[PDB]
Symmetry: C2
Subunit: 242 residues, 2 copies
């Protein structure tokens, strides 16, 4: 159960490209470093780090990276790869068949920086007070999985340094199994009969403390079986603290 | 004035008649084109399209075959295909962000199969229990169907009876075996047997079908199904081509 999801994100984050779509965690981290080039790049926070790829990649440019995920099982896998230098996972094949794969930390360029990362279990809607003073906070495919995203979005500016950045990516796949409809940031018809886009809703919440600097669509592919995959286009939004 | 399909039917309307996603050719067109190619040397009199959904592959097969029967388990899919055939247009709901929906219109005259749509008859039915009249086919195409049947062998072990001599059985499937759809004991492949050996679905298809068929070709065919404006399923089906006797 949990091992299936962990194996799936191991393949997503450390596996090979599919359909010409590049590694999502590398693309997001690389794009995040570009948008934050003018900043000190001392502390970064990767929320929804899952199996840790984006944190490792951010660490190549930042002095310290905190990786945070809600699932302890994902944190353990990231910590295992960090500490043991390798982790195994079961790649999904036809039906129930699985193909064992190894992730070797020493095979990736990020092996020059992995000690600059610390992985923690935590909830982005209510982060403990120690997670603060970041030059960059990135939340990868996270907002449409939070039970109340305003708890995170309305307060996250207090954890970012001045001239710091908040970078969000999301396919805007709002679902009642994750978020009650009244808390969707977008994808709904409001009480006045207007259709609300998630970006617009994010602008309403975030432009009190941020400026929207850029947007871009970043595709990603996650393997479900050897023949079935999810191909999704997430929208990255870049917000600079005002 | 236009017939409107529901959400489940609309997803297949978009899949079968909508715009190509990620540069991927329309799945129903690709399957029908390949089936026409593999049956080049057959009499092109009668074709059966099992799991025709909203009818695109049946219409496309009708450009080469004299008669095409389209059969689906869901009456709602049958009615959408028949409405497009009779009135020439249907409407469907495309999904966007969250609950937001786009609405589109399929016009029969906007497609090249407008020259052959009167050669198709759409029926509600079950591949595992077809009525006697559905016989004497030169081609039976079952698209992404076996891994949605509770006991796919019920259909496969008897399909040869509905196909003429030198006729063809063409299957496509991504082999997405799930206990929600198929009892594990009825999985044709994708499982470890009692001896510890992995069973491939193509091998299991050979065991069932080589009693009355010969395996002629296999081919990977990709398709994309839109789930939201940003989320899609990108899947590679395997088409297997089987000639009777």
């Amino acid at each position: 159960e949990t091992d299936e999801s962990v194996s799936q994100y191991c393949d997503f984050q450390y596996g090979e490209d599919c359909f010409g779509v590049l590694n999502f965690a590398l693309a997001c981290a690389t794009k995040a470093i570009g948008y934050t080039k003018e900043t000190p790049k001392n502390r970064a926070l990767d929320l929804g780090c899952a199996t840790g790829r984006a944190s490792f990649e951010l660490a190549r440019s930042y002095k310290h990276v905190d990786g945070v995920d809600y699932s302890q099982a994902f944190v353990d896998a990231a910590t295992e790869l960090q500490k043991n230098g390798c982790i195994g996972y079961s790649q999904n094949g036809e039906g129930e068949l699985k193909n064992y794969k190894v992730i070797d930390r020493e095979g990736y360029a990020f092996r020059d920086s992995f000690t600059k990362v610390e992985f923690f279990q935590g909830d982005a809607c209510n982060l403990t007070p120690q997670f603060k003073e970041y030059d960059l906070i990135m939340a990868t495919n996270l907002i449409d999985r939070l039970y109340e995203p305003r708890l995170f979005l309305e307060n996250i500016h207090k954890r970012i340094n001045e001239k710091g950045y908040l970078i969000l990516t999301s396919p805007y796949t709002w679902r009642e199994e994750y978020t009650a409809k009244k808390f969707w940031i977008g994808g709904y018809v409001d009480e006045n009969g207007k259709e609300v886009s998630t970006l617009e809703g994010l602008k309403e919440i975030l432009e009190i403390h941020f400026e929207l600097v850029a947007t871009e669509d970043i595709p990603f592919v996650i393997r479900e079986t050897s023949r079935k995959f999810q191909h999704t286009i997430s929208q990255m939004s870049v917000w600079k603290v005002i």
